[PDB]
């Protein structure tokens, strides 16, 4: 009765420590006839002969559990891989002791690998625990390493799924490149200042240099990294006040080997309690079959609970990782690594030392430096947003109304419609009218500046499917909203169901419905049954990728018109007005007050009598944001007085 245990080990002193741990494992574990034998191998510079030596030693040895504890002296990459693959061929368990790569967490590669150390991805758990201490909710994730950092990003999005509060922006790039300053500018432009990095040494030193070039060590900035960033040459160029994580006894090798041998020993003494016990044979002689109680012994190792340990209480999770590991939380007090906190698995306790921040005093960084400037996008709506080219040099002609009130114009930026069809300049331009003056009143109410720009292409924005993999995307003003290019859509935006699922809406400032523009012979709205089956004499359509398209796509009895007007959709409303003025159409489907304004302009343009889809123009907004309550309250304050009536007296009520 013997049990063979293999060990892949570095030194010669820890070989004696492994033999001493085998001797101590046979001390108090009963007078049973079982014994424990020790087998140790050393390094080779190339990994092929490492796997060759391991298989030639351990096929002849018939071991049960293999301990692998490679310290990376020449290279920090994938040295415990071959022993893991070799024993995972025969499904023999490998206990990794010094490696921490998250590629070992995926058991689709390593079928029979466990480890008594926690990987870097569970550091993200601590980073989630960094959010509950200071009540932080918006973070900026910068992942450098694409090898294992996607697993840490997935773990962070999994742990933030319980709060249902996503990160503000996640960024991924390639290790090795240096010029990553545009990523830093994208991290700059957002209101949050919490920066979370997981990287190797060299890319961390690169982004430390590039952040020192860009004032990112000042006040408000919060830097939160792991173990690989507080060492090497990255520690030489680390910004002061940084918060890092460190493994308590993570390189203490002797006690770690002893605790692993105790784990293996109690697993063996539990394995002898059961029957149907086999041995992994000499696999080099024609043995392609796996060891039959492989998953059984693996299930023993996964559910192996322990209360003994020199480092502490060791326990495996559902993925074979070290649970409830104590961490040190380190601060960099002017190029001095200072321990400022301890991490049990459920809670953080700081010590008597104070957490000196990267900025000025010891006050906590409320990392929401909210912007007084808001990116505003709108479309050229003729009764609402007049867009007109500048007079002399980027300036607007000061035009007066009928009462001598100066028209409050703004310097927006207007690109042309066809960028390859003509030399496209993207010149600034003048914006005024209804919604522009509403925005000027809103900026008059609350102290915030603004930058009005326009949409790249004249579409509101629809749920449009992209060609590869049939994936849904958004375009137009909503496509520029969700891409971060916009912050607040003040525009004639139609409220419906599909938009409010993704973005938020204020209370509507305009109440109107859909109606029909004709040339005057009665039509009498949508309830004319002859338009239900149209022909070449009923030529009518709507704006391409408008809200009318979605509203007619939902209602199934309006499908036939939806299968007609899809052949004649136009890019903008004014093109349809000019087409129906020359009698190239017969009707048009659009909102109420715009067509009433066009009827006030041109007497031949006639709106119909019926009315449907009584909805409201409101302000298109972002997600959870501090511009939800007071914007709606300011619109409602504009509704309770006669200011909306005065804006109607400017353009809506105004006849000609």
């Amino acid at each position: 009765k013997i049990v063979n245990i293999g060990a892949v080990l570095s030194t010669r002193k820890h070989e004696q420590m492994f033999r001493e741990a085998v001797n101590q494992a046979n001390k108090r574990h009963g007078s049973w006839k079982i014994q424990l034998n020790a087998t140790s191998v050393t390094h080779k510079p190339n990994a092929i002969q490492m796997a060759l030596s391991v298989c030639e030693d351990l096929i002849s040895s018939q071991v049960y559990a293999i301990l692998v504890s490679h310290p990376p002296t020449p290279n920090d990459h994938f040295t415990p891989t071959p022993v893991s693959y070799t024993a995972g061929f025969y499904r023999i368990p490998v206990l990794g002791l010094t490696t921490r790569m998250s590629i070992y967490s995926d058991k689709s590669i390593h079928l029979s690998f466990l480890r008594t150390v926690p990987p870097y991805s569970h550091q993200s758990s601590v980073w989630f625990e960094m959010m509950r201490v200071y009540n932080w909710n918006h973070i900026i994730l910068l992942v450098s390493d694409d090898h294992e950092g996607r697993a840490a990003q997935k773990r962070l999005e999994t742990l933030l799924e319980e709060r249902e509060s996503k990160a503000e922006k996640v960024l991924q790039f390639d290790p090795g490149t240096k010029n990553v300053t545009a990523l830093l500018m994208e991290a700059r432009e957002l209101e949050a200042r919490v920066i979370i990095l997981s990287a190797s040494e060299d890319d961390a030193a690169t982004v430390y240099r590039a952040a020192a070039m860009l004032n990112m060590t000042g006040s408000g900035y919060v830097w939160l990294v792991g173990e690989r960033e507080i060492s090497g040459n990255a520690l030489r160029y680390a910004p002061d006040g940084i918060i890092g994580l460190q493994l308590i006894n993570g390189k203490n090798e002797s006690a770690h080997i002893s605790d692993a041998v105790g784990v293996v020993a109690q697993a063996v003494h539990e394995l002898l309690e059961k029957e149907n016990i086999t041995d992994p044979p000499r696999g080099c002689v024609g043995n392609t079959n796996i060891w039959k109680t492989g998953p059984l012994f693996k299930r023993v190792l996964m559910s192996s609970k322990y209360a003994d340990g020199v480092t502490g209480r060791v326990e495996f999770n559902e993925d074979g990782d070290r649970k409830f590991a104590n961490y040190s939380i380190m601060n960099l007090q002017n190029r001095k690594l200072v321990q400022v906190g301890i991490y049990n698995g459920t809670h953080v306790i700081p010590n008597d030392r104070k957490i000196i921040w990267p900025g000025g005093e010891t006050e906590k960084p409320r990392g929401y430096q909210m912007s007084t400037r808001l990116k505003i996008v709108t479309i050229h709506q003729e009764p609402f947003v007049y867009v007109k080219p500048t007079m002399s040099d980027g300036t607007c002609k000061e035009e007066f109304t009928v009462n001598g009130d100066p028209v409050k114009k703004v310097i927006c930026t207007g690109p042309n419609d066809t960028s390859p069809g003509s030399p496209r300049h993207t010149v600034p331009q003048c914006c005024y009218g209804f919604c522009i003056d509403l925005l000027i009143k809103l900026a008059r109410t609350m102290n915030f500046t603004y930058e009005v720009h326009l949409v790249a292409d004249g579409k509101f924005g629809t749920q449009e499917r992209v060609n590869n993999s049939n994936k849904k995307e958004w375009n137009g003003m909503m496509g520029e909203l969700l891409s971060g290019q916009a912050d607040m859509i003040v525009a004639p935006l139609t409220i419906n169901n599909e938009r409010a699922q993704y973005i938020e809406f204020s209370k509507p400032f305009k109440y109107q419905g859909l109606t029909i523009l004709v040339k005057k012979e009665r039509i009498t709205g949508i309830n004319d049954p002859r338009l239900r089956n149209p022909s070449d004499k009923f030529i009518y359509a709507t704006v391409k990728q408008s809200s009318v398209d979605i509203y007619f796509r939902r209602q199934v009895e309006l499908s036939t018109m939806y299968r007609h007007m899809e052949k004649h959709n136009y890019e903008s409303a004014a093109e349809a007005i000019q087409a129906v003025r020359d009698n190239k159409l017969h009707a048009f489907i659009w909102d109420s007050a715009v067509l009433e304004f066009e009827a006030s302009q041109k007497c031949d343009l006639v709106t119909t009598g019926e009315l449907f889809f009584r909805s409201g123009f409101g302000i298109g907004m972002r997600k959870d944001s501090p511009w939800k309550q007071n914007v709606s309250l300011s619109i409602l304050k504009s509704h309770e007085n006669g200011f909306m009536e005065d804006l109607d007296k400017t353009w809506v009520r105004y006849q000609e």
């Binding site: 510079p45 190339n46 092929i48 002969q49 998953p295 559910s303």
Partner: protein
């Protein structure tokens, strides 16, 4: 409906509570072949194997075509890339076509591409790792992905009939499905108890 996982080898006490909430027709099951027999036996013991219901599994359980236990429901839909029309000879012919296409196309850029390692004892710019994307031999679009898979791979959609065997049903276009039978029958006889 909800996404139901497990914890351990089932006691049939609390995982049964997770299984009793299922009342919809189609069930996607993702588990190993050693687990799928027990899970489908628990589903059959709880009445989850009606002809109104449907069971679609990936290639994780559909391994050996010969090894079919009695607990597989007659009406199981699986997907595997094992094609009986393309044997091993056509596959190694396609592999040699990919290798010769990469060798003949990479030769047009730089000449001395093959540089093998000298020996396995005692330890490159132009590699085919970033050249394998644009390959087309004998009309077959055998292009590769960044994760190492195939862009247009050969899939096979099989069913389990009442004859307790696998029938090749669904073949594949460049992107979409081509069904041999647009009529989907009941496949009602799981056993005689229906």
């Amino acid at each position: 409906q909800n996404v139901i996982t497990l914890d351990t080898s089932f006691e049939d006490a609390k995982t049964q509570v997770q299984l009793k909430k299922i009342h919809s027709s189609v069930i996607l099951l993702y588990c190993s072949k050693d687990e799928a027999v027990l899970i489908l036996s628990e589903a059959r013991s709880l009445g989850l194997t009606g002809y109104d219901f449907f069971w679609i599994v990936p290639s994780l359980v559909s391994g050996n075509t010969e090894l079919i236990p009695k607990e597989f429901p007659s009406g199981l839909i699986s997907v595997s890339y094992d094609d009986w029309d393309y044997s091993l000879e056509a596959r190694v012919r396609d592999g040699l076509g990919i290798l010769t296409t990469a060798a003949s196309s990479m030769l047009e850029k730089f000449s001395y591409i093959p540089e093998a390692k000298a020996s396995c004892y005692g330890q490159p710019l132009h590699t085919l790792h970033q050249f394998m994307v644009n390959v087309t031999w004998d009309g077959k679009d055998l292009s590769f992905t960044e994760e190492g898979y195939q862009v247009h791979p050969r899939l096979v959609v099989i069913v389990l009939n009442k004859d307790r065997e696998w029938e090749k049903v669904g073949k594949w276009e460049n992107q979409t499905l081509s069904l041999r039978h647009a009529v989907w029958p009941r496949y009602k006889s799981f056993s005689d108890c229906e």
